[PDB]
Amino acid sequence: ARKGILGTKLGMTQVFDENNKVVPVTVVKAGPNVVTRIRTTERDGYSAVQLAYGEISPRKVIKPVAGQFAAAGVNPRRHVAELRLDDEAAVAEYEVGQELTAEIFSDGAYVDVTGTSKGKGFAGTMKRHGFRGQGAAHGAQAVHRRPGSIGGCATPGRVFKGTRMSGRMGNDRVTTQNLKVHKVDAENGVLLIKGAIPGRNGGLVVVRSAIKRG
Amino acid sequence: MKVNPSVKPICDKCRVIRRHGRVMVICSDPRHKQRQG
Amino acid sequence: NAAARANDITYNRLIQGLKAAGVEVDRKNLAELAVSDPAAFTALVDVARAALPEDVNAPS
Amino acid sequence: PTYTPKAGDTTRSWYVIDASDVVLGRLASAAATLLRGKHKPTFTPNVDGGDFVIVINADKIAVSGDKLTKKFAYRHSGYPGGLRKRTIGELLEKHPTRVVENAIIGMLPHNKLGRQIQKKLKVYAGPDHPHAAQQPIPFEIKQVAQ
Amino acid sequence: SRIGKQPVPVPSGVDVTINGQNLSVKGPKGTLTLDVAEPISVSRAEDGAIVVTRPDDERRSRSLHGLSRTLIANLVTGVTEGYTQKMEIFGVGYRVQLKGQNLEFALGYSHPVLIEAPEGITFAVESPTKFSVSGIDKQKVGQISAVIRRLRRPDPYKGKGVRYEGEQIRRKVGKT
RNA sequence: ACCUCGAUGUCGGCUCGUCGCAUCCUGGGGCUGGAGCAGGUCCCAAGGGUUGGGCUGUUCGCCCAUUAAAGCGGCACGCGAGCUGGGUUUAGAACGUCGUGAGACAGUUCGGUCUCUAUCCGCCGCGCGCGUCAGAAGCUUGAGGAAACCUGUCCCUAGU
RNA sequence: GAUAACCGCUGAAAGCAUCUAAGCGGGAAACCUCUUCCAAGACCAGGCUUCUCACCCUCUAGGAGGGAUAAGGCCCCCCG
Ligand SMILES: [Mg+2]
Ligand SMILES: [Mg+2]
Ligand SMILES: [Mg+2]
Ligand SMILES: [Mg+2]
Ligand SMILES: [Mg+2]
Ligand SMILES: [Mg+2]
Ligand SMILES: [Mg+2]
Ligand SMILES: [Mg+2]
Ligand SMILES: [Mg+2]
Ligand SMILES: [Mg+2]
Ligand SMILES: [Mg+2]
Ligand SMILES: [Mg+2]
Ligand SMILES: [Mg+2]
Ligand SMILES: [Mg+2]
Ligand SMILES: [Mg+2]
Ligand SMILES: [Mg+2]
Ligand SMILES: [Mg+2]
Ligand SMILES: [Mg+2]
Ligand SMILES: [Mg+2]
Ligand SMILES: [Mg+2]
Ligand SMILES: [Mg+2]
Ligand SMILES: [Mg+2]
Ligand SMILES: [Mg+2]
Ligand SMILES: [Mg+2]
Ligand SMILES: [Mg+2]
Ligand SMILES: [Mg+2]
Ligand SMILES: [Mg+2]
Ligand SMILES: [Mg+2]
Ligand SMILES: [Mg+2]
Ligand SMILES: [Mg+2]
Ligand SMILES: [Mg+2]
Ligand SMILES: [Mg+2]
Ligand SMILES: [Mg+2]
Ligand SMILES: [Mg+2]
Ligand SMILES: [Mg+2]
Ligand SMILES: [Mg+2]
Ligand SMILES: [Zn+2]
Numbered sequence: 001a002r003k004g005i006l007g008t009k010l011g012m013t014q015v016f017d018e019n020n021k022v023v024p025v026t027v028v029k030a031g032p033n034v035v036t037r038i039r040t041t042e043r044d045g046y047s048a049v050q051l052a053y054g055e056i057s058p059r060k061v062i063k064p065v066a067g068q069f070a071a072a073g074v075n076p077r078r079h080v081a082e083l084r085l086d087d088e089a090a091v092a093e094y095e096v097g098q099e100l101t102a103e104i105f106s107d108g109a110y111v112d113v114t115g116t117s118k119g120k121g122f123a124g125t126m127k128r129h130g131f132r133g134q135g136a137a138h139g140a141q142a143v144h145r146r147p148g149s150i151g152g153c154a155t156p157g158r159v160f161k162g163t164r165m166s167g168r169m170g171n172d173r174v175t176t177q178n179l180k181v182h183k184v185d186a187e188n189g190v191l192l193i194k195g196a197i198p199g200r201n202g203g204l205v206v207v208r209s210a211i212k213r214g
Numbered sequence: 215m216k217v218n219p220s221v222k223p224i225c226d227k228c229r230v231i232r233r234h235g236r237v238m239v240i241c242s243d244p245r246h247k248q249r250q251g
Numbered sequence: 252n253a254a255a256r257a258n259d260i261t262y263n264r265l266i267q268g269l270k271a272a273g274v275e276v277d278r279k280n281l282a283e284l285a286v287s288d289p290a291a292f293t294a295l296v297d298v299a300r301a302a303l304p305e306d307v308n309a310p311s
Numbered sequence: 312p313t314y315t316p317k318a319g320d321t322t323r324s325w326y327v328i329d330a331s332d333v334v335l336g337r338l339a340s341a342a343a344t345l346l347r348g349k350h351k352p353t354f355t356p357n358v359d360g361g362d363f364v365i366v367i368n369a370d371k372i373a374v375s376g377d378k379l380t381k382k383f384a385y386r387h388s389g390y391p392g393g394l395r396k397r398t399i400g401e402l403l404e405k406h407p408t409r410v411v412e413n414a415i416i417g418m419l420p421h422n423k424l425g426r427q428i429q430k431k432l433k434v435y436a437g438p439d440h441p442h443a444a445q446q447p448i449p450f451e452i453k454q455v456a457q
Numbered sequence: 458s459r460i461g462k463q464p465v466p467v468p469s470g471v472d473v474t475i476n477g478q479n480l481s482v483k484g485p486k487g488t489l490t491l492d493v494a495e496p497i498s499v500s501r502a503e504d505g506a507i508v509v510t511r512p513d514d515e516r517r518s519r520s521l522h523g524l525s526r527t528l529i530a531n532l533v534t535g536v537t538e539g540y541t542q543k544m545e546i547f548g549v550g551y552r553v554q555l556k557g558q559n560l561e562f563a564l565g566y567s568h569p570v571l572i573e574a575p576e577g578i579t580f581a582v583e584s585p586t587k588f589s590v591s592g593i594d595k596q597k598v599g600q601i602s603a604v605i606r607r608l609r610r611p612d613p614y615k616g617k618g619v620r621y622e623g624e625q626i627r628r629k630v631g632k633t
Numbered sequence: 634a635c636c637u638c639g640a641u642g643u644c645g646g647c648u649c650g651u652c653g654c655a656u657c658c659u660g661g662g663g664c665u666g667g668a669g670c671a672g673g674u675c676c677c678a679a680g681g682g683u684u685g686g687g688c689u690g691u692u693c694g695c696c697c698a699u700u701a702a703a704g705c706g707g708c709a710c711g712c713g714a715g716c717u718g719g720g721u722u723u724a725g726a727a728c729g730u731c732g733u734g735a736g737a738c739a740g741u742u743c744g745g746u747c748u749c750u751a752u753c754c755g756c757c758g759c760g761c762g763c764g765u766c767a768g769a770a771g772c773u774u775g776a777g778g779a780a781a782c783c784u785g786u787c788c789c790u791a792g793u
Numbered sequence: 794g795a796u797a798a799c800c801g802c803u804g805a806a807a808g809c810a811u812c813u814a815a816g817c818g819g820g821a822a823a824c825c826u827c828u829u830c831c832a833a834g835a836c837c838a839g840g841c842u843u844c845u846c847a848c849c850c851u852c853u854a855g856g857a858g859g860g861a862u863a864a865g866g867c868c869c870c871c872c873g
Contacts, residue, residue: 037772037841044841046774063864064770068843082772122758125649134647139717141747148648148715150756152708154641156838159756160651161780162390167758175829211828215663215675215798222708236846240811245664251797254352256455264457279313285352286314307457380796388778391651392827401795401825406776476787494815516806517814523805524815531803562639596817597850599802604819607800614668631668661821662799667832677798680822767846769865776835782822 001090003104004083004208005030006053009199014180026180026193035098036072045086054078063187073097102189110210111180115199115211129164174198178212216248254285258296268299316355316367319347324362338415341452346428365433370407407436460520465507465530468537484536486593494521540598543589548617555582
């Protein structure tokens, strides 16, 4: 029903079309993934599949985590995350210890990507929320770039909780929707995303079958 | 839909009925149908 | 009122019956008894219902 | 000196009440009276003296009039213009227990002792309950005649 | 009320079973069930008549007596014989046809219009200009009639659209 | 003239919004003196959006070119412990008028110091302590909050 | 999915008639989900596994105080 798989961004490039065009493509290394858990509604309250990825030496992994992996029946992995299903028909095909690779996706189908946006730092109001600066001339008095007025006076005499102003951006989960997959492989699990996805080089991204059009 | 607080049986055949606390007049003559509101 | 409702009578009816019976005991002692002797309340409510008239809605 | 409750002289009991076809106002008023404990002669307002009360079948509450569509339950999340509107019909369709919970919390004291009394009310929707281990005594609301 | 005083006759080839407040009708054309209002009671006269009774002379009983009587009469007569409503498709370039249980209407739209036929209703086309619907429940027959009629907006100028057998739409013309 | 003359800073512009619907478009309906398009009017509807310029300190207003529109209002005629002093609103000078005269003129014309290192509430983000009942690591379901919600043109049906 | 306005069906009070008071329904950028993020400090503080699951002393035997441990954590290092 709904497919998904984890991946890693290493670069971002372009590839050529059969319609003779050129399309930018994001390198996504969807390395091999192993099923470490199954979630059943009667025993837990929902249906989902938990996946682990990466290679970590057995001594760098925390001992309870290593024990949990041994109980699951697979060697230790780097990061762990789950994919949520919606019916037990898709649940029944997944079993503990099963291995998933990138060929499960067929080219021509939209995909959705989820990752952590870049760490931009504590930024000003105008850069963050796209405000407009005032004149840097005509007698400005050191308020060149700072927002200014916030609300009424003595009624309500406050700020309107939720007002858009200064704060740190980035370093949070961000999703991009309805993306081309241009080309997939079977050899070493490399998946291609036409466009630009959020995250970092050598960062963590998860790709899921598109909900919008699929 | 002539919406006005006062509604009357304009012709000899317009008919007044009651719906959801609003009384409206209906007639096969199209304009004679209105609600009071 | 709590004790009266436990003994299946209302506060107003209990007080009116008590006044009709002519008992001058005050709410301090009634409350201490309610904390203390449900036997005392059983006797008291019995007296109150005995002193209660036939019909409460009579024009009298 | 008058009587006041001591540390451990307080006693608790477990009551279970079915809510099938019972009027919301009457049921909730009786429940509030029971949780405050006005049924014991050892009532004292500065300490809790009531009993634990469990209500069953919160989705079977019956209310009179056309309020099934013309009564609204209001709350505001916090932002300006964040006022949101839902009806009793939608409330029982989505979370049946919320209506009884709100009705009872509305008549309990709105102080910290009141919300401490609120701590001891169990409200469920289904006909079963995992508190059969405490052998609650079934309770039927009755009126004294005079 | 006034009609409710008149008992509903029961034809011989119709079986009626009653259990408390729920009532059902058995006949050649099928089975149907309904529930009647609580305050009023209904009884089966031994001579083959339906007797409906109201307990008081109050508003609800007075209203519901006639409602129950006429509903039961309609139910029993529809179950014994049945119900047909026929329509006329007048206009130019207007085409109607039936395949299987579905109906396709070429009503001038750029896309074809398909309507799914509910359970317990039948459709039969005689001409591409007029067809008829046959069924057992006045509720479903009227529901289908209204649904079909509401495909086209009223046209008081050219008579374009759909209408029943005797339905008349007033004629009006503009000089401009 | 009831609060403020042991101080409630004033019009406009910039930035920043919020709320109501008596709605500008977009959405759904009733009627026509609605052949069709093209209309007029009334109802429901606040989800979203609602031009840029020339002129003047302007608000307003006139004009220029589109779009779907270039909404009405409330929020100390929103907002100077956020910014501007263009005018009103000091001290110069001058014009015209009034007054024999000092001076004045909701008449005009030129330039004329806008201070404050955030205590609390509030807010945008990030941290320390504590409990969730032996102690720890993961994955989480999720009540409950937030974000977003706009739209134009062309071709077929059919020049029927 | 339920609704505003609107359009219906069988229908009486009132032999008729009637979208409605019993009932059965269609019906929009509004409303509830569907999309995305936060989210068990949600005090009903939720759920499933994994890991160490016993060494004492003291006051006086009612409990309490102090020490010695594992899993794990922290410090510190190079850094992003
Ligand atoms: Mg940006
Ligand atoms: Mg700028
Ligand atoms: Mg500067
Ligand atoms: Mg208070
Ligand atoms: Mg005064
Ligand atoms: Mg004063
Ligand atoms: Mg001052
Ligand atoms: Mg001010
Ligand atoms: Mg000012
Ligand atoms: Mg309006
Ligand atoms: Mg319109
Ligand atoms: Mg009009
Ligand atoms: Mg509006
Ligand atoms: Mg919106
Ligand atoms: Mg200008
Ligand atoms: Mg305002
Ligand atoms: Mg102001
Ligand atoms: Mg404002
Ligand atoms: Mg203002
Ligand atoms: Mg300041
Ligand atoms: Mg300040
Ligand atoms: Mg001047
Ligand atoms: Mg000035
Ligand atoms: Mg001067
Ligand atoms: Mg002169
Ligand atoms: Mg002179
Ligand atoms: Mg002089
Ligand atoms: Mg100068
Ligand atoms: Mg100044
Ligand atoms: Mg300063
Ligand atoms: Mg400060
Ligand atoms: Mg939620
Ligand atoms: Mg009628
Ligand atoms: Mg009719
Ligand atoms: Mg917890
Ligand atoms: Mg350690
Ligand atoms: Zn008329």
